[model samples]
Target chain A: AEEFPVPNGFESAYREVDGVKLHYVKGGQGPLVMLVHGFGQTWYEWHQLMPELAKRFTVIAPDLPGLGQSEPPKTGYSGEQVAVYLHKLARQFSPDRPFDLVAHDIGIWNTYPMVVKNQADIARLVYMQAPIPDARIYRFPAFTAQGESLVWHFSFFAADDRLAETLIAGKERFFLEHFIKSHASNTEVFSERLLDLYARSYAKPHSLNASFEYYRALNESVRQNAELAKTRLQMPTMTLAGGGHGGMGTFQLEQMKAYAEDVEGHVLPGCGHWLPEECAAPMNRLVIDFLSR
Target chain B: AEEFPVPNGFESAYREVDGVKLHYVKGGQGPLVMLVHGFGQTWYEWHQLMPELAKRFTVIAPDLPGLGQSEPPKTGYSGEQVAVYLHKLARQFSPDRPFDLVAHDIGIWNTYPMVVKNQADIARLVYMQAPIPDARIYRFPAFTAQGESLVWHFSFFAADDRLAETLIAGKERFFLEHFIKSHASNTEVFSERLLDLYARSYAKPHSLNASFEYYRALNESVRQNAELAKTRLQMPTMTLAGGGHGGMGTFQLEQMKAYAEDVEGHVLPGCGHWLPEECAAPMNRLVIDFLSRG
Candidate 1:
């Protein structure tokens, strides 16, 4: 825990929220913006955007439980369960303040349900390139050839807990590098330093189990998200993907239109899945402009 | 190559059949039995049973090219292409004599097409656990939910040759053991020494590329095997599967009946796919009795 790095100049703290411990970083002032990171990374994914966004907004970024610095519950990693922790974070830090939401990957899945339960607390939303739970029946479209090609690891991750963990136990770098590099439009975007941090986070004890809980608990999330979707998102929203590589955000961006009254989708061309790091300047500029507007 | 073990007391030799050097081991005297190996394993698989099977019937086994001691071809690795080389072995080693056919895994694949092309040269046939090669349509069963469960690697292995090789390099033991241990009914059957040999076999420069050739050429084999299946084989045939464990051979056994006139099948209960190692006694007894009958 001492060896892991947090962004320079950001204040770190732990909050006991909803029977779980969440580690978050906060800085700047004026507007409040909660930045939640997704899988295989921590809040540092927003490091490039954090300093820039800190110039105008009070940014709060937390590691999702069983990921990064956050403490994982013994079980129950369903979206709603994760939302409980997210909602608890909002209540603790910005009790009277309204904050806009920005989330990626599983965090994206968690943000929707969290926002639905507290519509008045959140100002606007920025969704990244990731799968939207309950957008369809299957939760993830892995049955299709294209989906299966990219996400064949879902079965490998979910079915054999022992085998997946055994294979990945010692070969963490190669395993992590495979997913990041293979999916990135510009593999060079993931510098060795950044990868070391991401690797360190997952190297935590039971981190793999905690992380796999996201996929393992997808069944419950599907139902939870479906129920949450019953409440229309009246807030202005936008979905972003790395248009550089056809951007995974394309589908989620389009699907979000049905949930939000005013929503826009952007494909930041020449980027892959890691939009923040892949193209930080463009991603930060767009996020600032969208939230400001 | 020197560190790898061979079947006990069997004479080892290599023959340039179909432009590839194939390593073979043979011993015993009675009737001739060409014991062919399958994927990921070499002729060492027959080591346990070779001495015993040799007592009743002369046993000869070879490592399939690119898998064990055998060298892979420059390009051709399709089932029919491999069968052509196996056919060459029969002609060069025992041109005037009739030998019984015993094959497993990809061996089942290579033998099927070879025997069909020259049914008279081969005597009785014994097929261990492996796919029949010709009785299917789709490259893999992944199109549907059920098909995806068992052989999902069919697509991954075929799609990214470079990616698979990159990840599997130097991690041969972990990689190979995953497939063998996970799928085996008794994972302990794979001793460390045998696992080391299997890993070393695939650890060579062109080893991974050579091994994947069988998977890469699956589409062609699909059509080729279907075409070869046109003529029903008259030789007394038997399909041996790991049955006692409720494993996956009954279908291939039943499938063989349609192709052979006097087809017989046996399932070694409580055994997984590695029949020679998992159920050696029953496997040898079944083969010896089957060949002696004819």
Candidate 2:
């Protein structure tokens, strides 16, 4: 993965949005699908389903500000901040054009704010494995998917910034893979090839910390989600979770139903949290059908 | 301190009890005041208050088994183990006889069961600055005592046994001193000499891990406390808390009253958790007045 570059047929660049350069992958054509990835993952996480989705829709996946190749501002990356950034990216793609949105992990948390704030610009929304922001319950999952369950990391990382950043710096591979292997249905998806890509990408200075800044800002996300969720998204929303210990596919379904009137949910049988990579074929098909409908 | 050896006058040795060689310090000769120190502290923590109480009471303060100089058995130690061990230590001082009990921290928790089981051997029991087993509160001191305050380390040290022990191994001074400085009424009590003593005490191999084993067993203590509570203690019992952010003195008073027919409680005004050292003058006065009632 150290030598593996972004493959052909995709346009990759540092796009200026919110006045900060963000690393993004844009490919194919037709109705836009803004692909968002989660923690311990990058835009490359969508590689399993990206090309196929690209065949039918223009796919745009950007690293959360400060993660991967993106320049992270010191103000910190919150869900609202990333949503505003994506709003700018969406305008760059198609002005006032209602685009379909898909997100997982922190991506779902970030993108959902855009769905709530700029509903006029989004046609449909897909959230995968994660906890719902203001659902009365503590956590909700993304369109996809710790302990005996977390927000365990929520308090630990949020309380002490330097402790987490320092520990995870040189040990990014072990750091990310610990969650990846523990939270997935099948740990085998984390091949040496896949592991290197994520580990190396997150290994760079300010990389692991930048990624956690999103987690550290979860308090801000919760407050904002409460304010935004009050409006109630009328747009068609689809959420999916993997039916495994690692997957909150059921949890995602419950939360999506709570927030939207025209919402649909599916739990991929035995699938884990990383649905984009773990069940890419099925996930791609679900996206095409859900959006077209 | 690294060089200040275990001070004179107090007899220090590995007294074999409950089949384990235990580390203890004793000197005072009178009615046995079985003094037991809690986690993150050793029997030496009793140094400030011991000699004075020794003047009127046979002070017997033991490092909760396996903590300071006591070798931790491979299977791990618990409240019951310590209670039974303390009961044995009391017998060593006065076979087939009862003793007055004074305990702090995990020592307080461990001492309660014997106050229930060894009622014949205990004239009275004194618990300091902690909750009784079954409160079900988040933290007796933080939430219930100090508004929004938490036993922050209570949770962290409770989690991932190996991770915590591994991190605190070499950094024992930083680890223990961090709390002493933060949670005390006046951090000065934890002077360089005192800090060096405790840090070096904890810096010994398996030291930090032994200290934390008490916290990790908090759940087990809760269950046993509940079970022991079923048998009401007829003996007089007293509890104290520090009014400052760190103590659960008043909380202990209310809790101790629930089960014991005769219970007295007090909160040292403007004090912190390390009551022995922080409020030695007042603590000595309080101990003399309270026990002398009998």
Candidate 3:
């Protein structure tokens, strides 16, 4: 904790919203900007961009329910359930006003439901890396080397009877390091210390299982998103992707275009799935500029 | 070795065919009947079926290349490659006379290519419990409980970067037991001692990785089978499946009909993927009756 300090002017706080004790970092002043993280990361992932965005907006980066420092939800881990929990928490700040939202990885999956259902409450949206759960994801070939290399864990993690959990029990760092590094194009971005920090977070009680729960509810999320897609997203949405290994490339942008009224963005050149870390400058600039508009 | 003995007349033997020092069990009399085992077992799995089939035929049960006591292939693990290797070994016994053949699991994959390529050499075939690699196998859903439950290991074992092997290294027994039992409907068929025999074989040097090589070559096998499908299998073929958990059920039978001209068989009642063990008595009777059609 001492090695990585919170940036200047930022305060760590908690909120009991809809049965989840949400841990969040709050700073700056002005229109609210909510930063939601994906699997293998917490609010800590947004540290570099938080203070930068805090310059103009009040940044509220909370650990999603049942992940990072946030307590596990009493109910379920479906995208809609977590989205509603997060939406209620966001309401605590600007109850009557609209806010800007940015989410990555499974963060995109969880927050997407809220963005689509309560489009009026979210003014601008920035979603990176992962696509919202769709039937298309089910079509990835399992026998081919190319398909398994990219998303083998999607099935492995979501496996029943705690298969992945049991296999990965004592080998958390081994598995996490392999997982994080394999998806990353800019290998140097993940310092050994950074890997340790994320591994430690995931190693916490109920953390591994909770992270997998996000994937386990994927089928449910897909069904919900199909219904949610009936109403196209009204807000201006920015879709960002990596151009290198494990990156979704234009797939995210293309998928976003299908469900949104106005969507814009492109691949972060030579970047991988760790867009925020690998292409931090480009991501932050694009996000800040998009939110400013 | 002492615990799981070979049935009375059967003898363990080795034959080097096409650079692979193939290990097999040889016994019985009359026309040759090659017994091919699958992913989890070796010639040992045929301990019961071998003696029974040996009563009527010369049973030749060899471990698939790189599995059991057999040496890993010097070339590649592709279905056609291993199938050609096994066919060479089978010819040593009865070069002039057509032989009968039976295969299960990946054994069916490694041998199907040979059966189609050399239809005149084998008179009949009894392929149980697994489909030869087809493009259809790729269509199995990844997320659904039913899909993953039936064949999750298909992807898991074929994973690159040694991912599954690394995770499954020390936990071989844990994984193998869970794997064997889960796919089986009659779990009681797997005795504690029986599990030990199979687990011990997989734990051998290069054994685990070698077994996975079979699955990794599935795409290539699918391509080879696609071409081989043009020459529809001419031999009488018997397709058997288990109706219970992890069984391919009728799916295997349907796929066999598409590739072969003459296909016959049905679900072994209340059995699982481990047909040889789970439904030994019925499988033996059915296979014997099928091979006798000559």
Cα lDDT of model 3 by residue, B1-294, tens digit: 432467898888889998789888899999999989899788887888887778788999898888887999988888999998899999999899999998998989999888888889989988888878877877665555334546657777776677777888887877788888878889998988889888888877588889888878887888888888888888888899999987888988898888778889789878999988899888878987887777
Order of all candidates by DockQ, from best down to worst? Answer: 3, 2, 1
Recovered share of real interface contacts in candidate 2: 0.00
What's the CA error at residue A290 for candidate 2, in Å?
3.4
Q: Between the candidate structures 2 and 3, which one is better when assessed by lDDT?
A: 3
Alpha-carbon shift of residue A135 in model 3 (angstroms): 3.1
CAPRI quality band, candidate 3: acceptable
In Å, residue B259's CA in model 3 sits off its true spot by 3.1
Interface DockQ of each model: 0.10, 0.13, 0.39
Q: How are the candidates ranked when ordered by lDDT, highest leading?
A: 3, 1, 2
The candidate with the higher TM-score, 1 or 3, is: 3
- Runs of candidate 2 with Cα error greater than 4 angstroms are A1-8, A132-149, A166-188, A191-197, A203-205, A224-226, A241-258, A266-289, B1-8, B108-115, B128-161, B166-197, B211-229, B239-292
In candidate 2, residue A98 scores what lDDT? Answer: 87
Residue A138, model 3, lDDT = 71
Question: Comparing candidate 1 with candidate 3, which one achieves the higher DockQ?
Answer: 3
Residue-wise C-alpha lDDT for candidate 2, range B71-145, written one tens digit per residue: 674445556666787787788888856788888877877777777887888887777876665644442221111
Candidate 3 lDDT, A144-261, residue by residue in tens = 5343446657777786677777888778887888888778898898988898888888877598899898888888888888898899998888999998987988888988888888
